[PDB]
Design an enzyme around this catalytic site. Structure first.
Site, PDB file in Angstrom:
ATOM      1  N   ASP A 158     -22.906  20.592  -0.137  1.00  0.00           N
ATOM      2  CA  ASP A 158     -22.643  21.367   1.086  1.00  0.00           C
ATOM      3  C   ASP A 158     -22.707  22.838   0.728  1.00  0.00           C
ATOM      4  O   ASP A 158     -22.236  23.188  -0.343  1.00  0.00           O
ATOM      5  CB  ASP A 158     -21.325  20.980   1.754  1.00  0.00           C
ATOM      6  CG  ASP A 158     -20.139  21.365   0.968  1.00  0.00           C
ATOM      7  OD1 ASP A 158     -19.610  20.493   0.249  1.00  0.00           O
ATOM      8  OD2 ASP A 158     -19.639  22.536   1.013  1.00  0.00           O
ATOM      9  N   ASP A 175     -20.334  23.008  -4.400  1.00  0.00           N
ATOM     10  CA  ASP A 175     -19.649  21.863  -3.756  1.00  0.00           C
ATOM     11  C   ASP A 175     -20.367  20.542  -3.921  1.00  0.00           C
ATOM     12  O   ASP A 175     -21.510  20.379  -3.489  1.00  0.00           O
ATOM     13  CB  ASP A 175     -19.480  22.083  -2.251  1.00  0.00           C
ATOM     14  CG  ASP A 175     -18.391  23.094  -1.912  1.00  0.00           C
ATOM     15  OD1 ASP A 175     -17.695  23.550  -2.830  1.00  0.00           O
ATOM     16  OD2 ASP A 175     -18.170  23.480  -0.749  1.00  0.00           O
TER      17      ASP A 175
END
Length: 338
Positions: free
Chosen positions: A9, A181
């Site tokens: 992400d 992430d």
């Protein structure tokens, strides 16, 4: 996506070029930041979309516990979705109000709006924040299995099951931010469609065969029926509880004839097949336990090492453990969590 798939992400924090982190990670799956509040747009959105295969987009919530505000933030978000995807994410991790119920209602409203728009809603956050600021049980009540929870543990860039967040309804797990992430999928995407079945199952004294609509039946082949793969032998009976090697790879047909996907118990031993049904060899971790699996010359072996404290212990044929750990340093293998 399916169980154990990975995705990254990103936001403007990742820049206009995310090709590198996608390579390190070994996937093109992304969830990209679109917007925040009612006035901010991630300027890297189009480049990030372009360089990847998004499965979702997310919005950074600033509405607190104000429902009317949540509505406007959702609409601003929706208005800026650049392409259809399955999921749209409510990132709710900051500026909560004192009233935990107001917070919950505003989240539910944001989520209800994403649904009404024809996407699946996801609630993203971390455990202690969620515990203090909302009633997540009320979110799951309206939107089952819709959580994306962060819990990094030591945050060393790998998924470490000891620190798995325990909550109901977790669909995805952000297991690290080091150095970007990282996420792993806990549940297959929902497939709420009536499966096909272009024919009818027949059982005789020898086994199950499939009469297609046209009166013929599959034999000496793979065939997908009702969304599930089966293999039919030369006589038209589907294989059950049996290994099959097909084009150099190894498949396992379960007791109901369905091609195994994921972890599958074969007698008393565990084997892991990828999304395609093909057995994975080498080291594969199954939550806390490690398995070293081989199939050289069709000899199917599953070496199991059970965790206990800081050590892992080999389990013998007699289900017997050694007095001392076989290893304390984990092998660099495939991590699964389901």
């Amino acid at each position: 996506v399916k169980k154990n798939d990975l995705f990254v992400d990103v936001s403007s924090h990742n820049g206009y070029d995310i090709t590198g982190i996608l390579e390190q990670m070994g996937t093109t799956n992304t969830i990209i930041k679109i917007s925040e509040s009612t006035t901010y747009l991630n300027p890297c959105l189009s480049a990030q979309v372009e360089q990847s295969n998004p499965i979702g987009f997310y919005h950074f919530a600033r509405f607190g516990g104000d429902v009317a505000e949540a509505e406007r933030e959702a609409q601003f978000f929706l208005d800026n979705v650049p392409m259809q995807v399955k999921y749209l994410v409510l990132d709710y991790e900051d500026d909560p109000s004192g009233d935990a119920q107001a917070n919950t209602n505003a989240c539910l409203r944001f989520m209800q709006m994403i649904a009404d728009a024809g996407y699946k809603p996801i609630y993203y956050s971390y455990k202690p924040f969620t515990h203090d600021n909302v009633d997540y049980q009320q979110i799951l009540a309206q939107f089952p299995n819709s959580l994306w929870i962060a819990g990094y543990g030591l945050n060393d860039g790998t998924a470490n099951f000891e620190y798995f967040p325990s909550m109901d309804g977790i669909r995805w797990w952000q297991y690290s931010s080091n150095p970007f992430d990282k996420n792993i999928v806990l549940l297959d995407d929902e497939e709420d469609d009536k499966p096909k079945t272009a024919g009818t199952w027949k059982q005789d004294s020898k086994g199950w065969w499939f009469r297609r609509n046209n009166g013929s039946f599959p034999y000496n082949k793979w065939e997908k029926i009702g969304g599930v793969w089966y293999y039919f032998d030369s006589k038209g009976y589907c294989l059950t509880s049996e290994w099959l090697k097909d084009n150099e790879k190894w498949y396992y047909l379960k007791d109901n004839g369905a091609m195994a996907t994921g972890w599958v118990l074969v007698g008393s031993e565990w084997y892991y097949m990828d999304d395609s049904g093909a057995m994975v060899t080498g080291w594969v971790k199954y939550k806390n336990n490690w398995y070293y699996m081989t199939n050289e010359r069709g000899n199917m072996v599953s070496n199991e090492f059970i965790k206990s404290g800081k050590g892992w212990y080999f389990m013998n044929t007699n289900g017997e453990l050694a007095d001392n750990p076989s290893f304390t340093k984990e092998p660099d293998g495939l991590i699964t969590v389901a």
